[PDB]
Design a protein around this motif. Structure first.
Motif, short mmCIF file in Angstrom:
data_model
loop_
_atom_site.label_atom_id
_atom_site.label_comp_id
_atom_site.label_asym_id
_atom_site.label_seq_id
_atom_site.Cartn_x
_atom_site.Cartn_y
_atom_site.Cartn_z
N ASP A 106 0.87 -1.20 0.07
CA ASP A 106 0.01 -0.08 0.07
C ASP A 106 0.93 1.27 0.13
OD1 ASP A 106 -1.89 -1.85 0.59
OD2 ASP A 106 -1.98 -1.37 2.57
N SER A 116 -4.08 7.47 1.91
CA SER A 116 -3.67 6.22 1.88
C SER A 116 -4.36 5.57 0.26
CB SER A 116 -4.13 5.02 2.72
OG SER A 116 -3.59 5.44 4.23
N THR A 174 -1.58 1.55 22.94
CA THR A 174 -2.74 1.29 22.46
C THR A 174 -3.21 1.76 21.04
OG1 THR A 174 -3.67 1.35 24.75
CG2 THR A 174 -5.32 1.29 23.26
N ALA A 210 -7.81 -1.50 5.44
CA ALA A 210 -6.80 -1.68 6.10
C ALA A 210 -5.66 -1.21 5.49
CB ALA A 210 -6.74 -3.52 6.31
N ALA A 211 -5.96 -0.52 4.47
CA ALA A 211 -4.77 0.35 3.61
C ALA A 211 -4.50 1.66 4.54
CB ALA A 211 -4.98 0.66 2.17
N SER A 212 -5.67 2.04 5.25
CA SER A 212 -5.69 3.20 5.97
C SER A 212 -4.66 3.06 7.24
CB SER A 212 -6.88 3.46 6.48
OG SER A 212 -7.65 4.07 5.20
N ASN A 213 -4.47 1.81 7.50
CA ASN A 213 -3.89 1.43 8.85
C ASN A 213 -2.21 1.77 8.93
OD1 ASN A 213 -5.60 -1.76 9.20
ND2 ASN A 213 -6.15 0.41 9.72
N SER A 214 -1.89 2.13 9.88
CA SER A 214 -0.31 2.42 10.04
C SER A 214 0.50 1.08 9.71
CB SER A 214 0.28 3.02 11.34
OG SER A 214 -0.45 2.13 12.71
N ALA A 215 1.56 1.31 9.27
CA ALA A 215 2.57 0.06 8.68
C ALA A 215 2.90 -0.77 9.71
CB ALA A 215 3.73 0.63 8.14
N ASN A 216 3.11 -1.94 9.60
CA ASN A 216 3.66 -3.00 10.47
C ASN A 216 5.09 -3.02 10.47
OD1 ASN A 216 1.03 -4.94 8.68
ND2 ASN A 216 0.66 -4.06 10.62
N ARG A 217 5.51 -2.68 11.55
CA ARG A 217 7.01 -2.50 11.85
C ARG A 217 7.52 -3.71 12.74
NH1 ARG A 217 8.84 2.25 9.85
NH2 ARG A 217 7.74 4.14 9.53
N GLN A 218 6.62 -4.37 13.32
CA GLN A 218 6.92 -5.06 14.55
C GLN A 218 7.00 -6.60 14.00
OE1 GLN A 218 4.57 -3.48 17.49
NE2 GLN A 218 6.41 -2.41 18.56
N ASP A 219 6.93 -7.03 12.56
CA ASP A 219 7.07 -8.17 12.27
C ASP A 219 8.59 -8.56 11.98
OD1 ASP A 219 5.42 -9.94 9.47
OD2 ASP A 219 6.45 -10.99 11.19
#
Lengths: 252, 57, 271, 271, 57, 252
Positions: D106, D172, E16, E24-33
């Motif tokens: 994205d 986004s 939190t 789910a494209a609006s969500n913040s990036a996954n940086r903890q994977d």
């Protein structure tokens, strides 16, 4: 009595019959590096008794107009025994110390010394555009001397006890591990310095972990017809010395 | 949510904090930790010196 | 809590106990209270050492530099400014940190960015609201040589974009020393020879801030000045040192000029 | 966690085990540790590979273009600007993505819009705060031919309206390739003949951004420049490639000029 | 609400997150994977090669 | 296969891909001295990995008319690393060894070497009234050479392989720990010598525990148009080195 002590390290032993306790600097006693604080992955050599053992340095003459003396470590032990040899051949080292100062006198002599081990005692310079050179920071087994009043030079260390060679109150060198030798009380000081650095090990020629400074705060004085030569001897043993990064001798 | 007492007097008194970030460097500074140990500067001696007794026996 | 000791009630004494007498030839300092040298009453004491914590002492924002840059390049400021990161160009913040030998902390960087109109022979000004970039370039990154070059693309370099008339921008920075704490004083050299830079500046290598106007220059001239503020947070400090006595000379040396211990008095007895 | 391997303590050895010896004629690369070639101590190692994830590497905003437009049309910028969407007109962002052959992600698009006053023979300027439109036109949509035409009604076209002196606007964008991942390198052609465009530009068809001032022109002139920033998010990348060695020539080709592998040395033995 | 550990050291520590959007494209990036599998590049061989043994017997 | 081996000691490691096993001399593997066999009452220093680790000696050129080479130990390691430094500062030492000889060739070359570690290899002299001098017993890291035929001198070692420099059959140096390097088979020999003496520890300059001799029994031969320089390299690591009787450096 509390005045009598022995310290045995290796094949050396020191005795005192006047001492004012032992200062363990920061309440931490020398130890080997743990596996959870390590970062050098090769096996450490630990020469034990062969490097940990008292080494007596060159003595200095206490005079009535003396302003003090300093020796930087580990560079005062760089030619001392196998402690100095293991400095030559290894990139890293790591050691605590017990530093023992001796200075006896009669009961008709008076004077007071501050004996203090200062971590990271970076020193100023006479000229403000220049860094002090190695020959003026260090004398090896021989001490470098403080002067009563300000000095001049280009690469000379600014020496003047009042600033302590560091630009700070000389009277405030008491938050550092210290004892006093007052000639009417004790004839010896003992400080036990742990290894103190922000890296777990470091090179032993490129860095000086601490500097021992001995500064008269009450001048030597005695009535003429008494002993006029009074030495101060510094005998210092490594403790828990270990080294990593074995390679050819040198440091350049 | 973390609920913790405020600084208050002498002779409501809680606040709520929620962390909004994935790093602990982003968090507000810890100002309410009042632990001390002056004895490693003030009494850094091998043998315990009892106040009422002579320093040097 | 950080609450201090209570005074304990004490009566007359006559014993072989000697709390007052001590030897200072030990490194130990006396633990005497008033309850050892005179009568004393019981005082329940509620005073706290709360604000004398090192995480309250060091945790107030202090200006560390300001640097100027100009749209016109009026007075030799270029169209962008730069600053090699250090904490030693300001007396006040430097002194507080130099009461410790090693500090590990996180920082919080706040920027206070202002602009002013400059003298010009231009007539008629109606310059839009300025936008500014503040770019952090980690050690060994490419650096600006002009305001227009490719380095301001900030593809991996952390960067702030901020427009005037808004709240000061801030970002947290984590602990980031190579060591396990920052080193305020280094008694070593940068060479095994024992040559080169001596002092704490050997271990200084914290990157460079660059700042520019993002807007293209307008017919007059504006100079913008950016003031950088660091606040320690989450601090642990080790090895207390004396506070400085002498004024500093240089931001890379401790060189000092010999100065008086204290101020004058007329005599030993003063009132 | 992303924590790395611990060093394992190891003693002297003398065995027919040969961890050091291997054949590199296999595609396999050696798995040797220090615990196979010398003594070694046990080191409990807490270092993490957290920031070397591809979702931290690629997840910082990078400028991909800027385009200018002018109220006056002073210097041939028109009253609106356009940009055919691609990621290949900037070296830095392009190189990072071209370390992978396929990426699905994205995006997050942030715009940094600035304006500046222009030279004019106009006297007395007191121009209101500019408003700007940024319109995304999907492939095969009607396009602006002027600043005033019907296409800026944005009845189905996504659009941002933003006024100067406010926080940079962002939106986004989801994953939106025809394929199941974006294609960074295509070794094909756009024709079955094997003619026409060759390369990744065959598969590029991502629409066009248009941007204008919404305000009517005022007697002076303002030029506005809009800088477009893309940040990958939620990334999965596939098929690692070498990083680029050569500087790029073109944004639709990989054509390159022959360049040196590495920099010079005086001899085989250097210190 | 999703409560998840922060990035923190070495030798409160949660944050939190609430999603505010329907995409789910609006969500913040996954940086903890921090999952990895280097073996498909580093050891891409049909027969498992044991380190202590010869590569080629 | 039995032909591939690694030996890791300290921060050194050797690899072979042709070897003819490892000889453990007398079936005894190096170890530290026990408390029941000790007699030096001071604590022993054991430098571990810092002294125990391969040290490559100077290589010798194998020629068609070469008659052999010898190196005495511990005096070939007297200037080698911290092994040689701990010899300087200590009255006593005590160490086992792994000795590894390397000599590769093509499959169109032929020759055979005896590699043998001889305990107490006291050597004769050209003149029968005189003892051989130190310069002729030892070359340090450089080898001393055997000669094909009898030599003359006054303090020269009597060198002549047939007598092995010791007045004994050269073919009978096979009750001593030994391997052969035959160029059509193996390119390396390995012997592991325990500490062997009749005293539990001994001075390391005044005494040579054993001598490594390398003697061609089948001359080097190859057809002209092949490699004509073939070295023999001896790389030897101390094992379980420990030292007692710490004092100032020297040996006089």
């Amino acid at each position: 009595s509390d005045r009598v002590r022995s310290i045995t390290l290796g094949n050396s032993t020191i005795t005192t019959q006047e001492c004012a306790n032992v200062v363990v600097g920061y309440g931490v006693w020398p130890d080997y590096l743990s596996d959870e604080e390590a970062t050098a992955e090769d096996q450490p050599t630990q020469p034990d008794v062969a490097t940990c053992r008292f080494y007596t340095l060159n003595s200095v003459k206490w005079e009535m107009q003396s302003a003090g003396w300093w020796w930087k470590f580990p560079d005062a032990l760089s030619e001392m025994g196998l402690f100095g040899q293991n400095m030559q051949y290894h990139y890293l080292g790591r050691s605590g110390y017990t530093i023992h100062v001796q200075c006896n006198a009669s009961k008709f002599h008076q004077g007071c010394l501050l004996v203090v081990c200062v971590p990271e005692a970076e020193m100023g310079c006479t000229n403000a555009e220049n860094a002090p050179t190695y020959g003026d920071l260090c004398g090896g087994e021989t001490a470098k001397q403080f002067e009563q009043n300000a000095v001049t030079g280009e690469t000379a260390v600014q020496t003047a006890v009042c600033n302590a060679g560091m630009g700070v109150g000389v009277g405030n060198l008491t938050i550092y591990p210290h004892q006093w030798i007052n000639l009417r009380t004790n004839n010896s000081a003992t400080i036990v310095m742990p290894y103190i650095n922000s890296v777990p090990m470091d090179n032993m020629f490129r860095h000086n972990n601490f500097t021992l400074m001995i500064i008269p705060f009450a001048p030597l004085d005695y009535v003429t017809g008494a002993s006029s030569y009074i030495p101060i001897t510094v005998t210092v043993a490594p403790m828990s010395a270990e080294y990593n990064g074995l390679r050819l001798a040198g440091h350049q | 949510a973390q609920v913790s007492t405020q600084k208050t007097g002498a002779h409501i008194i809680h606040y709520t904090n929620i962390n909004y970030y994935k790093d602990a460097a982003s968090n507000s500074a810890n100002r309410q930790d009042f632990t001390q140990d002056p004895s490693k500067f003030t009494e850094p001696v091998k043998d315990v010196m009892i106040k009422s007794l002579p320093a040097l026996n | 809590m950080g609450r201090v000791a209570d005074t304990i009630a004490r009566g007359p004494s006559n014993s072989e106990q000697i709390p007052a007498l001590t030897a200072v030839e030990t490194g130990h300092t006396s633990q005497v209270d008033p309850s050892d040298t005179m009568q004393t009453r019981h005082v329940h004491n509620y005073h706290s050492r709360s604000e004398s914590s090192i995480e309250n002492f060091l945790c107030r924002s202090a200006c560390v530099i300001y640097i100027k840059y100009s749209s016109a390049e009026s007075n030799n400021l270029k169209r962008y400014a730069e600053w090699v990161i250090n904490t030693r160009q300001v007396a006040q913040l430097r002194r507080k940190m130099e009461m410790f030998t090693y500090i590990r902390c996180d920082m919080e960087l706040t920027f206070v960015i202002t602009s002013h109109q400059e003298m010009s022979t231009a007539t008629n000004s109606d310059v839009p609201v300025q936008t500014h970039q503040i770019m952090y370039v980690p050690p060994g990154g490419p650096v600006p040589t002009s305001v227009n070059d490719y380095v301001w693309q900030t593809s991996t370099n952390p960067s702030i974009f901020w427009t005037e008339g808004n709240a000061p921008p801030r970002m947290s920075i984590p602990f980031m020393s190579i060591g396990n704490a920052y080193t305020m004083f280094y008694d070593g050299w940068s060479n095994f020879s024992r040559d080169g830079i001596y002092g704490y500046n050997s271990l200084n290598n914290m990157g460079t801030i660059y700042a520019r106007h993002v807007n293209d220059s307008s017919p007059g001239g504006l100079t913008s000045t950016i003031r950088i503020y660091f606040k320690p947070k989450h601090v642990k400090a080790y090895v207390p040192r004396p506070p400085r006595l002498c004024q500093y000379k240089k931001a890379k040396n401790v060189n000092f000029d010999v100065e008086a211990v204290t101020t004058e008095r007329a005599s030993l007895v003063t009132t």
